[PDB]
Amino acid sequence: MIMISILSLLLSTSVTLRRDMSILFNRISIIALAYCILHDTMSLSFISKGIGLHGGLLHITNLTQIFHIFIFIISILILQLTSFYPRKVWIPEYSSLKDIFFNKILYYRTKIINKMGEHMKIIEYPLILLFVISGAVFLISTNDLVSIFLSIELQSYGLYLLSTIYRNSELSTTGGLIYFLLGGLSSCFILLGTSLLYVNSGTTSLDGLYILNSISDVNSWYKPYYLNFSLLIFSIGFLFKVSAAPFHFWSPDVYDAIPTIVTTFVAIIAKISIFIFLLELVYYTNSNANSYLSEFSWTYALLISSLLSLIIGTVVGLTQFRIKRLLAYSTISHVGFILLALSVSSIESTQAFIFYLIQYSISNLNAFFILITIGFSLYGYVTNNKEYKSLLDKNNSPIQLISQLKGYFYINPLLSLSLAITIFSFVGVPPLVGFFAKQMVLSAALDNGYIFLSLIAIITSVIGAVYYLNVIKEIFFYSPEHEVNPVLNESDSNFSLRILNEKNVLIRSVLLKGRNIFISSPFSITISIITNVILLFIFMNKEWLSMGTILVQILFSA
Amino acid sequence: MSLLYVLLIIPIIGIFLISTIDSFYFFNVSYYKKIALITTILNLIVSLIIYILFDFSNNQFQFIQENLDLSFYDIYLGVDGVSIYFVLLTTIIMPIALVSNWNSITNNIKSYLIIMLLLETLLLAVFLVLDVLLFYIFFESILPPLFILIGLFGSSNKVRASFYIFLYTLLGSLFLLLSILTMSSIVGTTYFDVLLKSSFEYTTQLFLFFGIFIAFAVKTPVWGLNSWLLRAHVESPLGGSIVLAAIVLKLSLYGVFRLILPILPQASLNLTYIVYAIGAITVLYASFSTLRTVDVKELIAYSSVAHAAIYLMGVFSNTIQGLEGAILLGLAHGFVSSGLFICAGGILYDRTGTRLIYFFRGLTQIMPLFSLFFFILCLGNAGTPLTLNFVGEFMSLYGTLERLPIAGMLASTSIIFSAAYSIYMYNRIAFGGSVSLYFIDCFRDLTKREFFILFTLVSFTVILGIYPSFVLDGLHYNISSVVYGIEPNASYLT
Amino acid sequence: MAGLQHYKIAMDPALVRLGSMISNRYKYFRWTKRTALVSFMYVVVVPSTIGYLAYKTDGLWDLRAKRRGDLISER
Amino acid sequence: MVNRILFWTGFGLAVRFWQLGIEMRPFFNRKSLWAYPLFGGVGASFGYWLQSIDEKQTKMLEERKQAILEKRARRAQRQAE
């Protein structure tokens, strides 16, 4: 279905040059991904460690199909950013169901809703978006060394294209160059690792590699050192793509330079596909008998990177003043927790891994959604701050500095509380979902004898909390630097709105002002659902946690 | 709907009404303050109904509601003697905290009341949960509302204060969380009725003890880990300060009864000489330090440190008297420290705008109602008899002396220095010359509001100081369950 | 000065300056011979002394119902 | 106090409340009042669905536990020799 949509969208896109079609194409991509969820919901009625498909080059598991749906749902939520205008006009005289569904309203919308904004004029943006999704879901379902390489390039090349698709921004083309150049080096290490597996084992099949690993784990002439060493080189390339330390330098630069709406997709979708792919490869290569194999296990690169990410993510975030660089470093610290759970290969840690990945993706999505919504809300506000005037790409990244959030609690108190809840979920304060995620990882690491890493995880968490608190302090402890726009409410600056019936006949005529210009419903509702999932998780945890419990039992089923 | 769940629900309804009433009526700020106050009053009324029905000699948790729809993280509530009086202290204190700020907020009043009401639900949840992870979840849930209370309504140095109280508490609690997770892994559950039944191995108990004690020492606080209290309790708004000193300090004390006395008795017995050295050091170093403190609220904040050391020494005495004294002193300190913060942060700081003790002199001449209550609270802070502060200090110190005499004698010396710093402060403020020449305007005496939030606090300490049996009657059988030891001829009856 | 208007005080500059120096003093602490010895006396020795005496004498005595011909020493 | 329908009816009610507060739109204007039944109706539907999911999850987890005691039994019985 994703492939039919890509081909069908491309054909419809090929024969048009109208940039006013961009919003419509984004909405059709939402509809198309909804069918993809339907076809994969249909496919979960079986219990198996895996079914190889299509000549054995692909495979399907219950885990694979669950995370296809999650990738689809995250992509639908993100696609809203380019499918609905950021602002709307609301009035009590056009709020009934008979109104929204039988009557129409008319006003000069173009300036109010930013009809011609850059993020509403890119025809091919939803199409490159679906290309990345195809690479991500193919990587999850990959069963072969060549399939691994093709899927990772497919996802990677699309992300480079998305970082540059805003071709008139000097920042975006610069960020696209950086990701491609360092990303291309990372892809050599993946190809080198895959090639070294093939030249030694004689197979591109992951099944066969697992069989070779399993027999060689006994307790002479062809001792299989290649498998751990190759997967070590192979894993390093995947650590770059999740921005794990010490391979993380690119992301604070790339995430800040590319537009925020692009950053939302680019910084979320890629970690889910790589981590899920790594999870299975960690399980089937994990030696049981303490032999010479286990001492050279490639998974120490994951444990070292988790350690290095816990320190770099929290320490370096202390001095960041630009909000997008802070989120990049906040992400690095969270992949430190994710990588600890992947490294401990226990039933408990795999449940913790599965839960942590989903809740962090939801939470990081909220932070970006709140940050974009605050940017779209400042339209009716002005400021005289000299720092804000000297910012580059203000239209692509309206909020660039933490100081821009100063006194946002006095501009929109409830939206500021949603930001605070999300950030407090990042620190791990109970009873927020973020706490329960960190709690499961720590309990699983503690139960497996990972005491030293568990202690560094708690210590770095206090350091990380400092810059989290620093964002909250700017929003709540100070009065804002933004003033409401005088000419929007000046007792005579009122624009007109017509309310018309099914037959385009006038019903009423109302004069409106800037205080009638609100945030669009898609963004407020998405923030409201996710914020309440974060806050109220303790009453809704049974099904969500039981899903991962069952998934791990299938994976571990002796 | 259990009475205990009613306790957690009323303050949430008050939050709903506070934040929606404008859609039904520009609403006046007086309305919000009246909704919040009545909300806390009905919560107090429910806690009094529970106490009438409460049974003093039952080893079953009372007023528990059957869930039976088990999930991963379920909230079970129940109450026995050790938790019943902390619940009452929370319900009595919070209305007084609301009145103590009636006139002194003047901005973001909706946010102040919603934060104050939420803090009540969380703090009550701490004392009512029947699970060790549930305990931790509520002990920590109060940091973000506490962080935002100080920053929104605190004094000049409220940024450094809010960071200190957040990061100290989190860092210590993270070590308590590690200890709690080890317990749940070995036992499979943190529910009280089945975790206390278990028996941990000595070295496990040893490492479980450090993790928990590191958190309880940051929260006591012990001397040297008390920077956060010096900053937060002073920079906080008056209502925040009352809640912080009279309720939040008690969570570590109540947590010693549920997390270490029943499960870690060997570790507690073998490590008392370390707890007592820290407890003895805190009694002396804090007492000497508050003698030289020049900010009136910091002097009163620093007194909390010295008294918290005394009931921290009591809970580790393994004696019936020390444990009863520790709860009675923690309760007594709740009323008296609340009154002393109202006297300093509410009465003096609203009149003068400063808290430096250098500027005050002879206040008795113009303010005889303030001095009358201030003296009675300075007597109670000195452990004078007919205050609940003496009964708690004497019972807490007797247990400390019997368990380990060298620490008892040193902790006893606090009878001198508590008096010393309490009366010395009292004289430099109420006595010690005529009215300070720095005051240009004359000052008015207690308003009716100030008189009645002090009369209420001095009534509770005095009545409980003459008849402490009201509280001791509901602690005798439950306190007995946490004692560890046996007599030569009573053990192993046949 | 604060949110709620207070009475007019003769805010003495010297006393105001003294109360600010105290609140800012922590920023100027330094490690020297004096400050290292005092900080080592209060934090280590005196506490470890009490800990030594508490450890050494834990269980040394019991006073309960002691009579003539029966000592107080328990160990 | 964990009822799937009551909780999720309220969750949908809370989503609408938080949404209107985020938009800084009035919480209760009479022409918009159809939305709370709608939000709570969709919320109730999500929780009837979660009911069926929880039922199937319970059956499958219960089946897995039996397989786990079954595996331990036939391994222990094999060790009797």
Next chain:
Amino acid sequence: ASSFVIYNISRPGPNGEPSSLHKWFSKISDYKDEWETRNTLMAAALEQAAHDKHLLLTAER
């Protein structure tokens, strides 16, 4: 005056039979075995719940 009045009328009287209001406060707070029944089922249910997790968490890889 109220303290003198209330104490006198609350006495059990020359005989050991309780007052009219004394019997109400005992009937309402009966709980003869209610806390003993409810607590036992909760403890047993959570003990089994801890057992099921112990099975799943320790399953052979």
Next chain:
Amino acid sequence: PTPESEAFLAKKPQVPPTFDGVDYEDNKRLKQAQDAIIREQWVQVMMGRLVREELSKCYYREGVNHLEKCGKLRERYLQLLANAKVKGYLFEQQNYWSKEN
């Protein structure tokens, strides 16, 4: 003997004060055992309270002759002071001991 009041019917321990034979899995019986431990300890101690009470009346009634007339009441308290102390159930619950050792 003093008749057993209605109050001293609802709180009588139906079980002996011991932990031998108790299945710690079964909650009712373990809780009853803990109840029997504590109540026996408290019952033994209030004996000292009544003996102390009687000795007080004896002391005043006898004045200077208290050193010679109140002897039996003196010793009975001293024995109780030597033995009776609420020590809890927790040690005995967690530590079995046998006399045939």
